[PDB]
């Protein structure tokens, strides 16, 4: 019933990664946790990309999917995103309470 446990573990594993990672020399988008996915250090003008977060209740059904977020040509993250691959396979229906909780984690 409580899968908030996995989201906080996912975030601090990302924070641990940022505390034990040498950043790339040059211009790159900083690795961070946007409360949805853990993003690695990404070169500029490059569509960053990681697997679907494993805190999702439907993670295994999309364990092979990926999240997308375009890094700008300046080291800052752009607005362009794509979480469609990691979405709920059957969107509206059950999973309300977490679809609802995840909607707050935006």
């Amino acid at each position: 019933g409580e899968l908030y446990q996995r989201w906080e573990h996912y975030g601090q594993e990302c924070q641990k990664m940022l505390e034990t990672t040498e950043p790339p020399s040059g211009l790159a988008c900083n690795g961070s946790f946007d409360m949805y996915a853990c993003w690695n250090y990404t070169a500029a003008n490059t569509t960053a990309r990681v697997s679907c977060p494993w805190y999702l209740p439907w993670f295994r059904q999309v364990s092979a999917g990926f999240v997308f977020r375009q890094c700008g040509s300046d080291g800052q993250w752009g607005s362009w995103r794509d979480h469609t691959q990691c979405e709920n396979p059957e969107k509206n229906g059950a999973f309300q309470d977490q679809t609802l909780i995840l909607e707050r984690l935006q």
């Epitope: 996995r6 996912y10 594993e13 990664m17 940022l18 505390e19 034990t20 990672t21 040498e22 950043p23």
Partner: antibody
């Protein structure tokens, strides 16, 4: 090459204070969390304290909390460890350590010896 | 606090032989999320600082030879050193890297027979 050089060790009177320093080089010091790990003479390793790159996350071992204080100076690439109320069981080789994903502790310094004796 | 128990505490081999040493944790070190085991193996030669050997139970660091191999999951872990050289004379520590406080084991001291 990743390099961590500790200093400040030596003889300390019982109950006295002593501040250790750790000079870092070969990496971006302001992006890494830092550790202090001790080892009593011919004993095992004992983790002491941890502080994040931004100094917003600080942990201490139970046998040290309240007496020791870990801090850093990122513009000077220096790790600090302030000891207070030292006893003989604090006699140990003190290492500062950096991590490398996926582990918290990867690179060790040469260590500086601290002896608590009258 | 997570307790680490290494066995055997002492060990004597001739040069060039396969050796195995155990390391058990009082609680599980496997994070069911990424399915990683947060165990770290260290090597400490006499008079020297500890050196990183294995991260995440089985991942060798850069420069570590193929002779050192970590394995296991959950609470039981093993470090295998095939073809032990005379330079492998050291104390081998396994460390809990799962949660704070980070705890080490008593260490398996590798001694050599000639």
């Amino acid at each position: 090459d990743v390099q961590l050089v500790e200093s400040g060790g030596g003889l300390v009177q019982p109950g006295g204070s002593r501040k250790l320093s750790c000079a870092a080089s070969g990496f971006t010091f302001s992006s890494f969390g830092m550790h202090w790990v001790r080892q009593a003479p011919e004993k095992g390793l004992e983790w002491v304290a941890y502080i994040s790159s931004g100094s917003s996350t600080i942990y201490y071992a139970d046998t040290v909390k309240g007496r020791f204080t870990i801090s850093r100076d990122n513009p000077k690439n220096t790790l600090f460890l302030q000891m207070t109320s030292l006893r003989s069981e604090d006699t140990a080789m003190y290492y500062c350590a950096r991590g490398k994903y996926p582990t918290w502790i990867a690179y060790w310094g040469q260590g500086t010896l601290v002896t608590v004796s009258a | 606090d997570i307790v680490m128990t290494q066995s055997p505490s002492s060990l004597t081999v001739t040069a060039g032989e396969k050796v195995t040493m155990s390391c058990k944790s009082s609680q599980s070190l496997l994070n069911s999320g990424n399915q990683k085991n947060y165990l770290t193996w260290y090597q400490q030669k006499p008079g020297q600082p500890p050196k990183l050997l294995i991260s995440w139970a089985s991942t060798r660091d850069s420069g570590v030879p193929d002779r050192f191999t970590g394995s296991g999951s959950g609470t039981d872990f093993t470090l295998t050193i095939s073809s032990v050289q005379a330079e492998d004379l050291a104390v081998y520590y396994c460390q809990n890297d799962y949660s704070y406080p980070l705890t080490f084991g008593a260490g398996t001291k590798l001694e050599l027979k000639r």
